[PDB]
Amino acid sequence: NSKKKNQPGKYSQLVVETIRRLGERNGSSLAKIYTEAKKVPWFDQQNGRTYLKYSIKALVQNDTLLQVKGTGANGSFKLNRKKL
DNA sequence: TGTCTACCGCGTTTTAACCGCCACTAGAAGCGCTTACTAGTCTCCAGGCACGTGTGAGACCGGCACATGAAAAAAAACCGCGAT
Numbered sequence: 001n002s003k004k005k006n007q008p009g010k011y012s013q014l015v016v017e018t019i020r021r022l023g024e025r026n027g028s029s030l031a032k033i034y035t036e037a038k039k040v041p042w043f044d045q046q047n048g049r050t051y052l053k054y055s056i057k058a059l060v061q062n063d064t065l066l067q068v069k070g071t072g073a074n075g076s077f078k079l080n081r082k083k084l
Numbered sequence: 085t086g087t088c089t090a091c092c093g094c095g096t097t098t099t100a101a102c103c104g105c106c107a108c109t110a111g112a113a114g115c116g117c118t119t120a121c122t123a124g125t126c127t128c129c130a131g132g133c134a135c136g137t138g139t140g141a142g143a144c145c146g147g148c149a150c151a152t153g154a155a156a157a158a159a160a161a162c163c164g165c166g167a168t
């Protein structure tokens with residue numbers, strides 16, 4: 001209601017598309033998504049880890065994605081919503 | 085066997101090692117003189133040794149308490165096997 005949806009960025013979409021792709025039973029990690037997200041040809045190496053860090057911070061706040069536990073450094077996130 | 089990236093090789097730009105020199109002087113090192121300190125010698129005697137003896141520390145053993153590994157079995161969870 002009164003909302004006009006965003007269009008999440010090219011890195012913010014990778015978080016969703018990699019977390020759905022190799023969807024762990026519990027908590028897909030920033031380091032794992034980083035490990036294989038960087039095989040993508042358009043990914044820029046020096047900074048892209050920072051962009052997946054920016055993405056998940058917002059993506060968790062959006063009720064788009066949800067994180068289960070801490071582990072190493074609050075680094076385990078599952079895609080919250082599958083619609084009813 | 086498979087995946088990821090830390091290492092290697094290389095060309096380019098930067099840095100400071102190197103060399104040869106000169107100027108300055110701290111301090112290494114030699115030398116003569118003097119005495120404090122050590123070796124050496126003698127005499128003496130007590131510290132530390134070989135020897136002997138006892139008794140309590142420790143080794144040994146049996147009985148028990150207790151820690152913990154491994155099995156069997158009960159409870160979670162997870163890893164697929166193939167469906168609209």
Ligand SMILES: [Ca+2]
Nearest residue numbers: 110111112113
């Ligand atoms: Ca001197």
Ligand SMILES: [Ca+2]
Nearest residue numbers: 130131132133
């Ligand atoms: Ca004595």
Ligand SMILES: [Ca+2]
Nearest residue numbers: 132133134135
């Ligand atoms: Ca003795």
Ligand SMILES: [Ca+2]
Nearest residue numbers: 138139140141
């Ligand atoms: Ca006695």
Ligand SMILES: [Ca+2]
Nearest residue numbers: 138139140141
């Ligand atoms: Ca005694």
Ligand SMILES: [Ca+2]
Nearest residue numbers: 138139140141
């Ligand atoms: Ca006694």
Ligand SMILES: [K+]
Nearest residue numbers: 118119120121
């Ligand atoms: K002297």
